[PDB]
A paper describes a structure:
The protein SidK, secreted by Legionella pneumophila, interacts with the V-ATPase to inhibit acidification of the phagolysosome in the early stages of infection. V-ATPases pump protons across a phospholipid membrane using energy from the hydrolysis of adenosine triphosphate (ATP) to adenosine diphosphate (ADP) and inorganic phosphate. Successful pathogens can subvert host defenses by secreting effectors that target V-ATPases to inhibit lysosomal acidification or lysosomal fusion with other cell compartments. This study reveals the structure of the V-ATPase:SidK complex, an assembly formed from the interaction of host and pathogen proteins involved in the infection of phagocytic white blood cells by Legionella pneumophila. Removal of the C-terminal residues 415–573 of SidK did not significantly affect V-ATPase inhibition by the SidK mutants, but truncations of the N-terminal region of the protein has been demonstrated to prevent V-ATPase inhibition. These data show that binding of the N-terminal domain of SidK to the V-ATPase is responsible for its partial yet specific inhibition of V-ATPase activity.
In order to understand how SidK interacts with the V-ATPase, purified full length SidK (residues 1 to 573) and detergent solubilized and purified intact V-ATPase from S. cerevisiae were incubated together and the resulting complex analysed by cryo-EM. In the absence of ATP, V-ATPase adopts three distinct conformations that correspond to different rotational positions of its rotor subcomplex relative to the rest of the enzyme. Particle images were subjected to 3-D classification in order to separate these different conformations of the V-ATPase, as well as different occupancies of SidK binding to the V-ATPase. While V-ATPase particles decorated with SidK were found in all three rotational states of the enzyme, the highest-quality cryo-EM map was obtained for V-ATPase in rotational state 1 fully decorated with three copies of SidK and reached a resolution of 6.8 Å. The distribution of particles in the different rotational states differed slightly from the distribution observed in the absence of SidK: 49%, 23%, and 28% for rotational states 1, 2 and 3 with SidK bound versus 47%, 36%, and 17% without SidK bound. The fitting shows that SidK binds the V-ATPase A-subunit primarily via its first α-helical bundle (blue bracket) and the three copies of SidK each interact mostly with the corresponding N-terminal region of one of the three A-subunits. Surprisingly, comparison of the V-ATPase:SidK3 and V-ATPase structures revealed no major conformational rearrangements in the V-ATPase upon SidK binding. In comparison, the C-terminal region of the ‘open’ A-subunit in the V-ATPase:SidK3 cryo-EM map is well defined (yellow densities, and 4B, surface versus mesh), indicating a more rigid structure when SidK is bound.
Residue numbers in the entry:
A (entry chain V): 10 to 158
B (entry chain W), C (entry chain X), D (entry chain U), E (entry chain T): 9 to 158
F (entry chain a): 11 to 158
G (entry chain Q): 1 to 345
H (entry chain c): 5 to 61
I (entry chain b): 400 to 423, 427 to 480, 524 to 560, 567 to 658, 710 to 808, 816 to 829
J (entry chain S): 17 to 163
K (entry chain R): 1 to 213
Write the structure that this text describes.
Amino acid sequence: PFFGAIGCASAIIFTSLGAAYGTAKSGVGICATCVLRPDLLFKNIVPVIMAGIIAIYGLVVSVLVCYSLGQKQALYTGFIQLGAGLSVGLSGLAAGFAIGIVGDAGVRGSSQQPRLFVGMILILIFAEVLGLYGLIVALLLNSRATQDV
Amino acid sequence: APFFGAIGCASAIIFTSLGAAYGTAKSGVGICATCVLRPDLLFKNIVPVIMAGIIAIYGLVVSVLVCYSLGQKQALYTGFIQLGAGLSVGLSGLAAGFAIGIVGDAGVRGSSQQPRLFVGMILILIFAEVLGLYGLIVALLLNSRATQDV
Amino acid sequence: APFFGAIGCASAIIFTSLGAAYGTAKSGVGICATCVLRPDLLFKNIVPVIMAGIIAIYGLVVSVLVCYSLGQKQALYTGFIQLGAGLSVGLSGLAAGFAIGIVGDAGVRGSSQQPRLFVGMILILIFAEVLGLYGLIVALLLNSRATQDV
Amino acid sequence: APFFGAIGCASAIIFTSLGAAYGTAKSGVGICATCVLRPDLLFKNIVPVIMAGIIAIYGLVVSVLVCYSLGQKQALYTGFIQLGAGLSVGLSGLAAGFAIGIVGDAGVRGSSQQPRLFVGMILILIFAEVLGLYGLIVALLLNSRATQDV
Amino acid sequence: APFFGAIGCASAIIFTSLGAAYGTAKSGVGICATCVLRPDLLFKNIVPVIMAGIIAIYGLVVSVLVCYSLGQKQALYTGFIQLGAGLSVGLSGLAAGFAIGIVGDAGVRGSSQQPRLFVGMILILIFAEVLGLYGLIVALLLNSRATQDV
Amino acid sequence: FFGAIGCASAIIFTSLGAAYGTAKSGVGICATCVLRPDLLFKNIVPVIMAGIIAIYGLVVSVLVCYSLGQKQALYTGFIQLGAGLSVGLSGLAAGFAIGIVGDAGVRGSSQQPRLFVGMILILIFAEVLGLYGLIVALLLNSRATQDV
Amino acid sequence: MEGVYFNIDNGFIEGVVRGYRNGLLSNNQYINLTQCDTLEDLKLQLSSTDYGNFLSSVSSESLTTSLIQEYASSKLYHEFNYIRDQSSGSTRKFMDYITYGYMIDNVALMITGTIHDRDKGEILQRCHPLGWFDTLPTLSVATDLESLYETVLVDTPLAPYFKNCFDTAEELDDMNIEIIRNKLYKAYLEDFYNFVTEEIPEPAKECMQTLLGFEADRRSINIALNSLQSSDIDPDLKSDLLPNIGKLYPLATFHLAQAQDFEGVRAALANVYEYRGFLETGNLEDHFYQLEMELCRDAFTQQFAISTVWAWMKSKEQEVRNITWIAECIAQNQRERINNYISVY
Amino acid sequence: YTVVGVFIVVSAMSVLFWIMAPKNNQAVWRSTVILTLAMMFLMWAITFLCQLHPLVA
Amino acid sequence: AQYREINAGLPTIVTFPFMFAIMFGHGFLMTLAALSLVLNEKKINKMKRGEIFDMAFTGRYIILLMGVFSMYTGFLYNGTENALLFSNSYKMKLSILMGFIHMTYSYFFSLANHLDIIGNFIPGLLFMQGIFGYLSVCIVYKWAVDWVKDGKPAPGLLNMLINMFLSPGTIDDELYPHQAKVQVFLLLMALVCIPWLLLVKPLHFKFDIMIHQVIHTIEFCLNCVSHTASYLRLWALSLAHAQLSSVLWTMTIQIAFGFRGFVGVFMTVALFAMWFALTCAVLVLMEGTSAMLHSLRLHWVESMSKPYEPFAFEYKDMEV
Amino acid sequence: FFGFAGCAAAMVLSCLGAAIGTAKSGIGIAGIGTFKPELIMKSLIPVVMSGILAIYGLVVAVLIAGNLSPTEDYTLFNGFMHLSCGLCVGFACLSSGYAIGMVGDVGVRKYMHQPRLFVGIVLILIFSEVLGLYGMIVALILNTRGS
Amino acid sequence: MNKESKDDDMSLGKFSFSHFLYYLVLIVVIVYGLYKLFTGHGSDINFGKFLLRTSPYMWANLGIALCVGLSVVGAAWGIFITGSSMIGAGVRAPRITTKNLISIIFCEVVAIYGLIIAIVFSSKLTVATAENMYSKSNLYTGYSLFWAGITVGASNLICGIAVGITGATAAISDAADSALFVKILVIEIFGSILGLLGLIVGLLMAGKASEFQ
């Protein structure tokens, strides 16, 4: 065994890829929305900062899972961390993938009408429950991996 | 023993979070496009985002129950019912979110022009969530047999 | 044995939930467009989503019946008929849901112009449940012989 | 002794160099397209290439620090650590370079007609480098325990 | 021993030669003449071929350094530590060669019309050309400790 | 022993290439026959020329099938795969080339009777690749029966 | 990029497409023939090129306007219909899709001209998949959408004119030839983006994407400049969708299309092409011809690429229009004014 | 042994542009000698015999 | 951009050419080619040869100062270098101490401007001054570690990488052992700089500040690691250019002198001409690729100091 | 017997790269109506230059096949170095032929377009030939250091 | 062993999907099989600590028939685009497009090239032509004939494809038979000599694999 390091890095890699795709999808709609009028550029920056907050859960989960790692690697310490990191990584990647399209659609629709910032901010801000549930499942899965031989 | 049963608990929340993310994105795209033309239908069209995002609680509760039913020791035959129930709940939540997003986009686009299809659009989106409840019930029935071995 | 019979239980509800979600999305995509042309056909268009969603109960019933047969102990020959019954009911439910989606969308678009064409679209969706009924009967007959000991 | 962690040090600089090269190409395409219309924003738009190319220094310093902590005995407490620690910084640098490419191309194309979002694009890249820095911190934390294997 | 790790020296110039070939191939493509000639762009466009070929020049030195440290017969410890340096220079040389190819094609097409874009177009490939040396330094650092195996 | 698929691979590849060349020659002959009823006899050369390649794979499959089931070992089922792949690749390439060559020769011969001699010359000269591949399969099948 | 895939039909179709383009006339022959003014010298000078076979098949003692359209119409049938009969697969499907894309607006012009007492014999030469003896007489004479749906469905494969006929059957496009031509041009650009999106990653396409992207903005600027001072409708489909979403917008093309003196958007979008903000239609057409000619000469020399087939298809229509305007200008005993500047690009 | 002794010997026996300067360009001429001398001090070239035995391993 | 005296391009005239000349004796060709365009500037202005050579001919003082300063650092590399992992261990740690003086000089120059009536500069350069000060102090003490209480794994980045991860430890390795409180005082001084940065803004502003202090805190936190992380390009390009020059010179010098007679003059003349021809293009490629210090000094150095005023101010400084 | 796969697969990439480079370079010599002045005047350098890539893999495969023998030291197992030695020259010859084909097609296409940029296609195309020499030099250096 | 039927099944399955790729849409090659094979090989090769490789045993003979089959299959595909060029021209001119059939002789010689080496590479046996690992040792001599014949067959297929690719553009190539077509024929000869050079270098580097006993 001794292969739990890729599962530990997959939580920050999936949240970093989902946050990068959400920031790219937010900047893609913000680049087209900024061409119409330079009066709502500060309002469209909320999707990149909201999508970038999902990487802190995978980073703190990767640091907490890395802090409980033992000196001897075996089969009991290289199987639960892969699913625990893959759960928070896939949850942050799905939340970043939905936050990218939600930030792109809200950033594109926010150019013509500035009143959609409440609904786009609420629908875009309502995607953190998947990453929080994935980090909560990764904490419970990481809590049962102690005493590795 | 391998002790690799956490992939079944992670696959349920991964599939439910992916289906809820795709349904929330597909419902938020048509909700944003229909909300750009008029903001009065935002509160009526806001139900599909919560309905698509509510499917993640089944995979999160199934992963929490599968993680709570794991224990300190595992065997080789322990990681089967969690993988089947996790894959079934993940596929059911992904199909329910995929149908919920396409139903929410056409519901918001058709409801943007004339505000009369909200009864059928709310009934289709409220009726398409039964697959996640059936897969969560099958994941609970498969999870009930995982608290006796080991 | 490994006791890996959960894939046959989850494979029926996965393909059944995916085909039911695809059929409900296919009927909900055309229901919102057909509801704008005639307000009287709004309540009549809800029958294809409920008719397409009825095929999901076969994989949930076969997975719920096959879920109790696992238990804690297993063997080398127990766990093979459930995969064939689950994949057999899942493929027929996914194909019946996929054909029921395009048949419901084409039946709603053709029924939007004239009301006499709704009997053909309802007849195709009513006639497309024979594959799911035969696959559910074969999955029930295969699931009935799987439980012999324990 | 047997070890397989040698590819983990070289795997770290691959994703950051590929994402930095793709971000430099996507930023250079919009900078070259915007430099033809007005030569005043050409010197201002050149900062995102050098700012995007600084993400490879974290993977190169992590690869040099992981290569400096290499011992003479290979075991299970040294192998597989540099692959995940370098793979996390490589995937974070590849995602930050991939977002910096679309952010630089969209910022250069939107700033080509009317430059008003240059500080927003530079703040988007400066806020996008923190995703690579967060992966680099976990790669340094996992890379710090790659020595003393028995 | 196993005698695995000899492909690391030959694998170095593969991605670097493919990236330099893609950069030199993509640099000549594009508009270079419009009516009868260009504004001295023929003498300026020759820099991206040598700039893309610099990583291929360093890849032969890295592959020669790995080939000198390969040897006829060595232990399994030096073989596992020797492999891995070629993929780091190969991936960064391929990504920097692809970014130098796209930046050379866009800088050649945009530089064909206006000659003022060659200053930023040369600085884009000059700033993107360090990806091969950044991986070559890590490959030389890992290859420097692969000698004197026991 | 796994050389049973080698005897069927030659007739499978030659039947597939002859089927595709006969389909393209029949489509080109049917499309060229609508413009004039005099080119029907001239347009039938590509289907008859492409359909003659099945006899080499059938005779090679019968000859390779004749040495199976009586004398076989762990080293006697290797030549049938190379001979069947050899005749199958040459028959499949010659059928696909003879189909487009027959369609282009029928389209060029439909305008005037000038390209029909060139298409009939190339179609008559394209059988050397099938005969050279058939001679290697006959020479490989004739040299068998070495290890019991 | 290119040269890494194996294509059997693409090599013969690319060689047969490059063989007709190599034997065609050049800019030196058009510049030399444009300077001279004589009906007898035009037949002798034009006999050396590839059009000397069709022009030499039927000719009289005087220059006629009917023989000029019959020469390019006879050369277009052998240059376009001859390659489709000898080809098959995705190359013949894309080549038939391009001829169906040009036949979407070319058949729409005959369908709109059918109400004005127009037939198959009263239409000019245009790019199509077949001649006007199989599908053009029944499609041009057929005024009902039910017969045009079965006539378009009878051809293999399915063309994009069925959706335009279905949208035009309910009166969803326009009541004039302007809105039907703009919606047909936008649907033709959407179909070219659909086939160019489908068969895109066979080779490495670089000049085809820039030629289609510049041709979309040149077609939108030409459609907005054509309706300038014509009182066009801002809420009507007259703005073709382009790949640029940060330089050219639909509101700027719709506002610039109306007679309000709003040509500053073309000057803001300028500095990258041959067009510029002005008030002369001849200078805008000459700059649009030189802008469309850019990236077209590179496709005539490069081989093993899918963009060279579309660039040769547009270069055949541009060379047929330039040869028809050059022959029509000298056929009337006059000197070209706008065709002389656009004779070389 | 180190270059800190040579840089301390240069800094000890050197004013380092202190204190006055010329009239024309007194700021660049004043800080230029201190920046070049401080750049040379960090560029003192402290060679081997602290990390000697090169050409290893 | 109308600053005449300060502070736009004051430290860029020394920090620019000194840090730019470290990437490039190979510096004699840049000083000869840079000094050759002095008298021939009027005739070379109307020759019309190249676009980068015209901008290099306009900035004759920048290429003359950087070309003259590049010969000093270039002559030392091409200290000695005879093997691998010997010369790079000192040239790698030399760029940290070389860039730390310009980093502290930019903070002192930024702290000198705006002259409580001062603030927003006391918290900056406190965490990086402690971490980078202990890393530069460990690199300075690492070259004196003889006897055995020393080591070169690497030093520099190895001590800072091992530090900040163990409070109970003292140093690993080659650090000042007096005894363990260096990391505690560094972590306390770096952790105390968090509230003092945002707290010192309203006291220094007087005799919407929250978002500016948070964005300046995160931008200072990212630029503090990016500014120290961007220093590797000088030693990377210097070691790559020195290895690329010494490989061709060592691979051509031995073959040039062999086969005495006419073959040594012809083969040595052709090999020396091709070697010098490739060496001039390699030095021109490194000089063209040495703009990273100008870009990072123009954006990152100009962001914490105060624009294109330092580029014209650096050339206008040597002219007046 | 495992060492013969590298020598047999050594020139397989150089022959496929030189064949595609010669076919891609020869495919662009069709146009455009001038054969006396410029086609071929200086466009024959890529076709003849691309054929020299197979000689390095063929000579390296003949030297690697002649160097190894069944009675020599082959009980290691150390025969995996011949696969990297042959694949190193094969990938460099294939990339050099693939870049030489696109450089010859771009130089032949841009040669007839402008009469002033003819030296740029030759100067840019001349640098592409040095790519395949590194795999042959590394293959000969790896074969010289072995048995 | 198990690799005996897997090698023939994979060899037939690769040519089946490769031949079905250019055909009508009935089947297609699995692109995920390469990433699944690389991930499955690197995953099992990475963990655990063990040498992962293959072992050839006895057969060693598929390169002999595969060389002549690959040369005949490569030579048979070049004549399609070469012969279709003259029919593609048609009535455009009576020029050298009907007299440029010299490339078809080299394309027909490309099928004999490799097949002559495969015919001369066996004598006095059909099961084994050298020392095999079924009744003796020294199986490298019989093992190298498979890779040498596969390399010579692939080189003959590439030269045969390059000959037809040169001839199909080298039919007439300007507009007619007024300009000489020898410029494309020079590149066709330069891409035609690679089969003879690769066959001479592969035959010389391959060694002797006949007269087994």
